[PDB]
Write a protein that binds this ligand. Structure first.
Ligand code: NA
Ligand code: NA
Ligand code: NA
Lengths: 369, 369, 77
């Protein structure tokens, strides 16, 4: 449209003969996401809900992506092993990491999902040392209404990274920021949603109440839903992972949706209140294999492409059979090298756009018991 | 510093033999602004308070900066005149606007203040028409903790602009976003502060309670102060300006600090509660000339360079003499063309960095009555 | 808690409430248990033996703030 062709009718609040007060009031009342964020961006965006995923980003590793190449790791491996708590499976192999990355990318293209590639500078560092954990682009996933700057609870090598990814989203995709988390801890990217307006968090190394409150209030306002629910798990875990039990600081290792009102869930995730809530809201639970969970094969770290279809680690054989048994298609993908750090396949995907999908009301109305 | 020279001692929460829990807890407790925002930015930033201003940005106008060149203005001038409500002083003269802009910039350099220049694309438009009001870079002023995306109450031509300026701040200065205002209305840039932790807002076309609450909560957390106070004026005005009284939707037309515990204030600004509060907190009031105020010469739209020194419109002779009488140096600067839109000199300056300055306790302890 | 509070003979009464992840009595995948006495006990003044599967973040914070020293039970046991 031409610069001199604009007219007052292009302003949605304008009406012929409207008063100043009524125009201003219509403006105060407009929805931020649909009046400002999306039009200005010139597109929709956000990973909220359990609808159809259409657009993601990955990072292809270099030597600088590997945690064991940091001089701070070299100085004390046991310090970082205490923070993450994941079983030692020996050093990361760069070439194999790159291959499993190509395979994941192929899986996306074979399922009609656009993949962007995020690079970091050579010798990437923040004010406190080499970047660490920066392969895990879910930490920069995009919410309805915009990007979020996280407060990392346990990993100093992620300081500056959620900024970097948000900046990248703005410069490359034109997607704006929504909020910076400025108190306590909140890593929203590692959360999952189990319905259009149901978020799962944890209270953990990665989340305190203040951080959670800040995040939930911001994403609530732009979620596009009348209601917003936060299920808050309470795992027993000091750092990121408890290799004695399989409990994890992050929701996305403990639980995810695999279909409408159907969840894959860890043995170590559900306290009584959480269990009661899932029960009252008609969610059907598929239990992850306990050994797969405890040995950190990340069987719950599946990525939902759409209700009834997930990407999962190819070697989570037992959990995957149970998912198939629940009527869900599983796309097996190699994810071995990625687990050598604190995460699996879902953890490493930055989700950019997911179309609106089924709601909590849909879950509740499902007849299955 | 070299990429392989980093050690655990470069992590401020690290201590030899610290437990995972204690390390995580120290991390949850760290201050966002001083641990993350500023280190990652690699500088300090924020205009908060009444301390020494060091860094700003201006926009040098082109024909596309002029409000009367918009096809939507051409279609109905009376519609835009109802929104702003400012006295008609005839069309803007581009050449004169450019000259008064050079003069303002010279004033900054003569006072040791760095000036950045913001350009817009040719034929700048948003989803709803030509940009309008985009010369007013105070709307993009930077807060301690980061940039803000505003919700404009009355001007649709500012949609997309606060995003643009925030994006510019991030790409050019490395300053991150703090929050997007997503409900009601809040134009934080047009507010002023009268002490290190005292903000003045209005309830007006430009601000509702929900928007105000959202903004104040975000900037509170990063203000670097134990307390945060919001004085909320209640002007009687439908749009932006009331040419019968001098009342204005924006704090920065109604009031500003000129020194520690000394304010220049409009006749039309102070309701009883506001007056009581200023009185109880030991603020000395200098009244702006009523005619200067009502005729929209913007005598309160002075910019505080530091306690005891302001930039003011050169033709606000009466108000300026009173400011000098109160012991404050006035740097007179031509601001005629700028007033042909909804604003004056302070309105057009994006404030990027102001050093910490006097506090509310300092105001209260001043012996003057 | 209200009943035993009134007769405890103490000015204050505190209830630490663990939140184990367990459906029935015992979770043989983790060691989590419905009963406190399988999850934790005192062994001395301000010293506790505690299961890996017992302490959620709030419980952990509370024990920390109140100066309790924790001895971890062997995970396999
Ligand atoms: Na719970
Ligand atoms: Na008031
Ligand atoms: Na507890």
């Amino acid at each position: 449209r031409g610069y001199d062709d604009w007219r007052l009718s292009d302003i949605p609040q304008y009406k012929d003969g409207i008063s100043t007060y009524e125009f201003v009031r219509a403006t105060h009342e407009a929805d931020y996401r649909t009046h400002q964020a999306e039009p200005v961006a010139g597109r929709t965006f956000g990973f909220n809900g359990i609808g159809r995923l259409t657009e993601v980003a990955l990072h292809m590793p270099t030597r600088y992506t590997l945690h064991d190449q940091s001089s701070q790791y070299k100085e004390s491996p046991s310090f970082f092993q205490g923070l993450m708590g994941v079983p030692d499976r020996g050093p990361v192999d760069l070439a194999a990491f790159q291959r499993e990355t190509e395979e994941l990318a192929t899986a996306f293209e074979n399922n009609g999902i656009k993949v962007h590639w995020v690079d970091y500078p050579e010798e990437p560092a923040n004010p406190y040392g080499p970047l660490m954990g920066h392969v895990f682009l879910s930490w920069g996933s995009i919410w309805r209404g915009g990007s979020v700057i996280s407060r990392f609870g346990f990993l100093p090598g992620m300081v500056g990274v959620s900024e970097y990814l948000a900046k990248w989203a703005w410069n490359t995709l034109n997607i704006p920021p929504l909020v910076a988390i400025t108190e306590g801890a909140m890593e929203p990217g590692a959360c999952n949603m189990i319905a259009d307006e149901v978020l799962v968090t944890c209270l953990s190394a990665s989340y305190d109440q203040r951080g959670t409150d800040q995040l939930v209030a911001a994403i609530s306002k732009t979620s596009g839903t009348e209601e917003f629910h936060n299920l808050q798990l309470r795992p027993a875990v000091e750092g990121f992972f408890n290799k004695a039990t399989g409990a994890c600081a992050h929701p996305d290792i403990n639980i995810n949706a695999i279909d409408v009102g159907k969840l894959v869930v860890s043995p170590a995730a559900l306290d009584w209140d959480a269990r009661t809530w899932l029960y009252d809201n008609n969610f059907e639970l598929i239990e992850a294999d306990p050994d797969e969970q405890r040995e950190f094969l990340a069987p719950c770290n599946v990525l939902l492409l759409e209700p009834g279809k997930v990407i999962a680690h190819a070697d989570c054989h037992k959990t995957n059979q149970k998912i198939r048994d629940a009527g869900v298609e599983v796309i097996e993908v190699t994810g071995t090298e990625i687990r050598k750090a604190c995460g699996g396949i879902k953890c490493r995907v930055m989700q950019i756009n997911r179309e609106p999908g089924p709601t909590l009301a849909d879950v509740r109305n499902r007849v299955w018991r």
